[PDB]
Amino acid sequence: ITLTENKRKSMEKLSVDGVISALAFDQRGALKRMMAQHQTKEPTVEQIEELKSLVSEELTPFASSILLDPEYGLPASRVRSEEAGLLLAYEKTGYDATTTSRLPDCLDVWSAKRIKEAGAEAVKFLLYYDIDGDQDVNEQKKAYIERIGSECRAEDIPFYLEILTYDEKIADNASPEFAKVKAHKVNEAMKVFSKERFGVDVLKVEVPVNMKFVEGFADGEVLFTKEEAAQAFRDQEASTDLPYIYLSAGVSAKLFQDTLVFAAESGAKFNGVLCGRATWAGSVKVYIEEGPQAAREWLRTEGFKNIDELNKVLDKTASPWTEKM
Amino acid sequence: ITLTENKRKSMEKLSVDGVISALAFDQRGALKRMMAQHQTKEPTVEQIEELKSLVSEELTPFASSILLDPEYGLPASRVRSEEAGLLLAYEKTGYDATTTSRLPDCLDVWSAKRIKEAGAEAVKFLLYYDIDGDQDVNEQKKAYIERIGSECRAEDIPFYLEILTYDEKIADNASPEFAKVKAHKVNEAMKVFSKERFGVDVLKVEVPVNMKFVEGFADGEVLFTKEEAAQAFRDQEASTDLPYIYLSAGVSAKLFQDTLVFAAESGAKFNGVLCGRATWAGSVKVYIEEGPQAAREWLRTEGFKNIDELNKVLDKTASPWTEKM
Ligand SMILES: [Ca+2]
Ligand SMILES: [Ca+2]
Ligand SMILES: [Cl-]
């Protein structure tokens, strides 16, 4: 609620007129798998670092900040636009699929202090959370986030907590079965991690509905009327007093934009986005198949078009965090 | 080197006249194993927590503070004397004997915040450190301690870091081979974790020599003259500007105490001790074999004698931490 002077200065460096128009590219495992769909060989470290730098160079002139990973993204962080702020990811990528606990784990040789020393204006951490899951697992997860929030307090650096929801007993979070419980998963997790003890400054969250099953957006089965969907957005806005920003979860650029419009019309007062794949996903194929110059031209044309159309939508949908602090 | 008002206040609650005369009893597996020797059945949680409470009730009137573990020791913490402060252990016990890395790990449902909420005036964490070991292993350890130091800064609670040294290639730290390098291990590790970035308020460390190989204290081979050992203590004193206190584990009560005398004589300005095993060990056989009433009587009589002998030696050897400002 009350930002320290340094935390506020950092929030300002990440945003424009209270809106976070951030580019997300801390993907590692998720990126590797995209690359592996066009590549016979294993993608190299140089390839991963290069595409990250290409996205940074070409697109951060159009974002208020960029989120990168320390593993492959530090060269990319240094060629970002002068006007763009920096977030660094702090969690190890992915989860163990042989169990349902998805426990969080910080990068082995990092700390919040180190992230700040590396030039970041925010620490980002991704937590998988099932509000209905095993209570002891969740106890361990809450303790873990308490520690990170305390680090960020001490180092006086904003804590961006990303929450990705799941159900221990539903395999596919794109299924109709998950869509029926998504709003509950998202909104109740936001309520938990908005407690003061967790030290969060900004929540990076999913929209509380799977729009593919909403009337007017759906191409197949319809699970929700527009009014029911709108209510999920209002319930989400009522689930936190913190700034919150949306992730794209890799839907099309157009569906993500249309979702932002719907969210605003419904009453969500979201404060921006940390948007990755919806913007740059198409560059992966070009980069692998046609190389870096071809990917650079893609970024300068299609990439720009995506981020520019996104920015125009944000301009008319997002609300400033400087009305919540 | 500068304490906040709360950190200072907490340090004062852990000390008497700037000397730490703290009773260590955060043993978990080790305490269970001692008990397992004197009965057939598996020692229960009730038994373990009762013995900690007996020791706490009967001996903390004579200690400046007591170190307990959150696993078995919270009930004991609440019956400590009102004159005695509280430290709680934050680390998981032991290390994997398969590997040489001895990596640290916090207790899974704890945080510095939760340790403070449980009434502690300090967070205690044990780290195993080989200054000459794998440098990536050591970067991971250093990052880990940075996180903990940052938590404790945020929660405004003193951070007591215990360092136990080892060598990746020497199996027995009682060997002559380890004795020859112990001063190097201990003192260099103190130089590392005295750096401001680790946030340490008090170091809990080994004496920098194995007195069993020192002239006049050895009953077998002599590796060191009294003058060389004296120099090792002075090198230790010059390895940090933080308060530091000695741990025992490894030697008899009498030898530890004679070592305190030798330490002071040599020019060490150590600020106290965190030692528990020598003082209460005899109560364990008594508690299992004659019940809680007998144990209480053991603690009142033999137990008091033990801790009083130690306190009398501390009065002649330890220097105040207040002096280190
Ligand atoms: Ca609790
Ligand atoms: Ca709200
Ligand atoms: Cl133990």
Side-chain angles (χ1 to χ4, degrees), chain B residues 227-285:
Chain B
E227 180 55 35
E228 285 159 346
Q231 185 63 47
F233 282 98
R234 297 193 284 272
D235 291 343
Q236 183 173 52
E237 164 66 33
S239 294
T240 185
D241 294 333
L242 295 169
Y244 65 96
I245 60 180
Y246 292 134
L247 56 104
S248 192
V251 297
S252 78
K254 198 84 220 182
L255 179 51
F256 178 61
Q257 290 171 24
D258 293 336
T259 299
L260 296 184
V261 173
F262 184 89
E265 286 177 334
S266 297
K269 315 300 290 173
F270 74 99
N271 304 110
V273 300
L274 240 170
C275 52
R277 184 149 197 163
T279 276
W280 49 255
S283 67
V284 180
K285 180 166 179 264

Side-chain angles (χ1 to χ4, degrees), chain A residues 107 110-111 114 146-147 155, chain B residues 107 110-111 146-147 150:
Chain A
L107 297 165
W110 291 87
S111 62
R114 293 176 183 208
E146 286 167 22
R147 303 173 193 168
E155 308 295 319
Chain B
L107 299 167
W110 289 87
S111 58
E146 290 169 19
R147 300 179 196 165
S150 287

Side-chain angles (χ1 to χ4, degrees), chain A residues 51-121:
Chain A
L51 185 59
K52 283 186 184 251
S53 295
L54 294 176
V55 169
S56 182
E57 287 177 40
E58 294 301 329
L59 297 185
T60 58
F62 312 113
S64 64
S65 53
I66 180 169
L67 160 67
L68 289 158
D69 56 308
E71 170 173 15
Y72 300 105
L74 293 177
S77 74
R78 299 189 273 267
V79 296
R80 76 183 191 274
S81 161
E82 178 179 50
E83 282 75 40
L86 174 65
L87 309 87
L88 293 174
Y90 190 20
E91 82 284 347
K92 292 176 172 176
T93 195
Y95 55 95
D96 184 351
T98 65
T99 62
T100 60
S101 45
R102 306 194 189 185
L103 291 164
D105 194 10
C106 292
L107 297 165
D108 288 335
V109 296
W110 291 87
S111 62
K113 180 184 284 297
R114 293 176 183 208
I115 282 170
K116 187 188 189 192
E117 288 169 335
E121 288 120 353

Side-chain angles (χ1 to χ4, degrees), chain B residues 16-315:
Chain B
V16 174
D17 301 328
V19 178
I20 299 161
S21 58
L23 179 67
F25 201 3
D26 57 348
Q27 281 85 345
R28 286 151 269 170
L31 172 58
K32 191 170 188 176
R33 282 185 297 276
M34 296 171 68
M35 288 169 69
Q37 289 180 296
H38 305 113
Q39 72 182 21
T40 318
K41 69 174 192 182
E42 178 185 15
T44 68
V45 173
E46 295 100 305
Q47 289 179 311
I48 298 165
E49 299 189 332
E50 177 170 35
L51 183 57
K52 296 216 181 208
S53 295
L54 292 184
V55 170
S56 182
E57 295 171 8
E58 298 296 330
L59 298 184
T60 57
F62 315 108
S64 68
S65 52
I66 185 166
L67 166 65
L68 288 160
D69 63 298
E71 179 182 358
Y72 301 114
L74 294 175
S77 69
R78 293 191 294 263
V79 296
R80 73 183 190 278
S81 172
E82 286 179 352
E83 278 71 81
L86 178 66
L87 311 93
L88 289 177
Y90 190 20
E91 87 285 339
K92 291 186 183 176
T93 64
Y95 56 89
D96 174 14
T98 291
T99 64
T100 62
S101 46
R102 301 196 193 190
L103 293 167
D105 198 10
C106 292
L107 299 167
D108 289 337
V109 293
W110 289 87
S111 58
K113 183 180 288 291
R114 289 173 186 214
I115 284 174
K116 187 172 186 199
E117 290 171 324
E121 279 115 4
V123 171
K124 171 269 180 168
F125 194 89
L126 167 62
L127 175 76
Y128 291 96
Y129 206 74
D130 181 355
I131 188 72
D132 307 307
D134 182 270
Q135 74 181 36
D136 293 305
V137 161
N138 283 346
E139 280 301 327
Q140 180 172 355
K141 299 184 170 177
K142 283 180 253 185
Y144 208 78
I145 297 311
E146 290 169 19
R147 300 179 196 165
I148 292 165
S150 287
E151 291 193 70
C152 293
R153 168 170 164 100
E155 297 297 319
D156 218 10
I157 181 165
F159 181 22
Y160 283 54
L161 174 70
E162 177 183 354
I163 306 169
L164 290 177
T165 60
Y166 73 113
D167 191 293
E168 284 177 353
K169 299 195 203 306
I170 302 165
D172 190 346
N173 67 339
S175 63
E177 183 186 357
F178 190 82
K180 290 175 188 174
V181 297
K182 185 187 188 187
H184 173 80
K185 304 291 193 184
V186 170
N187 296 336
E188 289 304 322
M190 286 175 62
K191 291 181 206 179
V192 175
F193 287 106
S194 292
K195 293 179 179 179
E196 188 237 288
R197 67 183 299 105
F198 297 112
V200 177
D201 295 294
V202 177
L203 291 160
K204 169 177 167 181
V205 295
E206 305 160 282
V207 302
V209 52
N210 180 349
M211 294 298 291
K212 289 187 167 139
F213 293 106
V214 182
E215 183 78 57
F217 298 86
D219 64 274
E221 181 183 33
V222 176
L223 298 180
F224 304 108
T225 66
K226 285 168 179 164
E227 180 55 35
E228 285 159 346
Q231 185 63 47
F233 282 98
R234 297 193 284 272
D235 291 343
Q236 183 173 52
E237 164 66 33
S239 294
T240 185
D241 294 333
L242 295 169
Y244 65 96
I245 60 180
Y246 292 134
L247 56 104
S248 192
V251 297
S252 78
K254 198 84 220 182
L255 179 51
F256 178 61
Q257 290 171 24
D258 293 336
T259 299
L260 296 184
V261 173
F262 184 89
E265 286 177 334
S266 297
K269 315 300 290 173
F270 74 99
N271 304 110
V273 300
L274 240 170
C275 52
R277 184 149 197 163
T279 276
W280 49 255
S283 67
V284 180
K285 180 166 179 264
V286 168
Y287 172 84
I288 305 292
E289 292 190 359
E290 313 186 60
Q293 187 43 63
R296 199 186 282 281
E297 253 307 281
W298 189 92
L299 293 163
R300 289 203 185 108
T301 51
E302 306 310 329
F304 167 76
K305 190 177 187 292
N306 290 344
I307 197 161
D308 189 70
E309 285 181 353
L310 169 63
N311 292 337
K312 282 197 216 77
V313 169
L314 286 178
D315 292 346

Side-chain angles (χ1 to χ4, degrees), chain A residues 234-242 244 269 324:
Chain A
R234 287 195 289 276
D235 288 352
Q236 180 177 55
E237 177 56 59
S239 294
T240 188
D241 54 356
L242 298 176
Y244 65 97
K269 310 255 253 148
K324 295 207 275 235

Side-chain angles (χ1 to χ4, degrees), chain A residues 6-302:
Chain A
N6 287 353
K7 283 202 171 190
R8 178 177 295 275
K9 289 175 181 178
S10 294
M11 285 287 290
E12 286 164 358
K13 286 184 186 308
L14 295 174
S15 67
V16 178
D17 201 14
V19 176
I20 299 156
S21 53
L23 175 63
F25 202 0
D26 62 343
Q27 282 81 346
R28 285 152 278 168
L31 173 61
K32 288 172 187 184
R33 291 188 296 276
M34 290 172 86
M35 288 178 147
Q37 292 169 21
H38 317 294
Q39 194 78 314
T40 25
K41 69 168 158 163
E42 217 201 324
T44 69
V45 166
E46 294 76 359
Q47 288 182 331
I48 294 169
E49 289 191 347
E50 184 171 36
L51 185 59
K52 283 186 184 251
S53 295
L54 294 176
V55 169
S56 182
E57 287 177 40
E58 294 301 329
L59 297 185
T60 58
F62 312 113
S64 64
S65 53
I66 180 169
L67 160 67
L68 289 158
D69 56 308
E71 170 173 15
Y72 300 105
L74 293 177
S77 74
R78 299 189 273 267
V79 296
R80 76 183 191 274
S81 161
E82 178 179 50
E83 282 75 40
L86 174 65
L87 309 87
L88 293 174
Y90 190 20
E91 82 284 347
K92 292 176 172 176
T93 195
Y95 55 95
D96 184 351
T98 65
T99 62
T100 60
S101 45
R102 306 194 189 185
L103 291 164
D105 194 10
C106 292
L107 297 165
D108 288 335
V109 296
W110 291 87
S111 62
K113 180 184 284 297
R114 293 176 183 208
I115 282 170
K116 187 188 189 192
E117 288 169 335
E121 288 120 353
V123 171
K124 174 268 183 170
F125 192 90
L126 188 161
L127 181 72
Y128 292 96
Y129 206 73
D130 179 2
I131 184 69
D132 304 309
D134 183 275
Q135 66 190 39
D136 299 312
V137 162
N138 280 349
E139 202 62 51
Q140 181 172 351
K141 289 182 177 179
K142 282 180 273 184
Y144 204 81
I145 297 309
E146 286 167 22
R147 303 173 193 168
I148 301 168
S150 288
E151 289 192 70
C152 291
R153 177 174 156 84
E155 308 295 319
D156 214 7
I157 183 163
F159 180 21
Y160 281 50
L161 178 69
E162 177 178 359
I163 301 168
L164 288 183
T165 62
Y166 73 113
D167 189 283
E168 295 176 347
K169 304 217 322 161
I170 304 170
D172 189 342
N173 72 330
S175 67
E177 186 177 17
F178 189 82
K180 286 166 194 179
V181 300
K182 186 177 184 187
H184 172 76
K185 301 288 194 191
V186 171
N187 292 342
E188 288 303 289
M190 285 172 69
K191 218 169 155 169
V192 173
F193 285 103
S194 297
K195 295 178 62 169
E196 185 179 317
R197 69 183 301 99
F198 297 114
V200 179
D201 294 291
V202 176
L203 291 160
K204 172 184 172 187
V205 300
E206 303 158 286
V207 297
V209 60
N210 185 346
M211 296 297 291
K212 283 162 191 142
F213 290 115
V214 178
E215 128 197 296
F217 299 84
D219 52 332
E221 184 192 9
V222 179
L223 301 175
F224 315 103
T225 68
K226 276 176 184 166
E227 184 40 54
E228 291 166 339
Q231 188 61 53
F233 282 97
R234 287 195 289 276
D235 288 352
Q236 180 177 55
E237 177 56 59
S239 294
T240 188
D241 54 356
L242 298 176
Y244 65 97
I245 61 180
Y246 295 128
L247 58 98
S248 75
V251 304
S252 62
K254 179 57 171 178
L255 179 56
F256 188 58
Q257 293 159 21
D258 288 347
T259 300
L260 296 183
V261 172
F262 183 90
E265 295 175 335
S266 296
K269 310 255 253 148
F270 74 100
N271 306 112
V273 297
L274 246 173
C275 174
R277 280 160 301 176
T279 294
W280 53 255
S283 56
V284 178
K285 177 169 186 163
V286 180
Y287 174 76
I288 295 290
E289 290 182 343
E290 305 180 54
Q293 188 51 37
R296 193 186 284 281
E297 281 302 323
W298 186 95
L299 291 166
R300 276 168 182 165
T301 53
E302 295 307 330

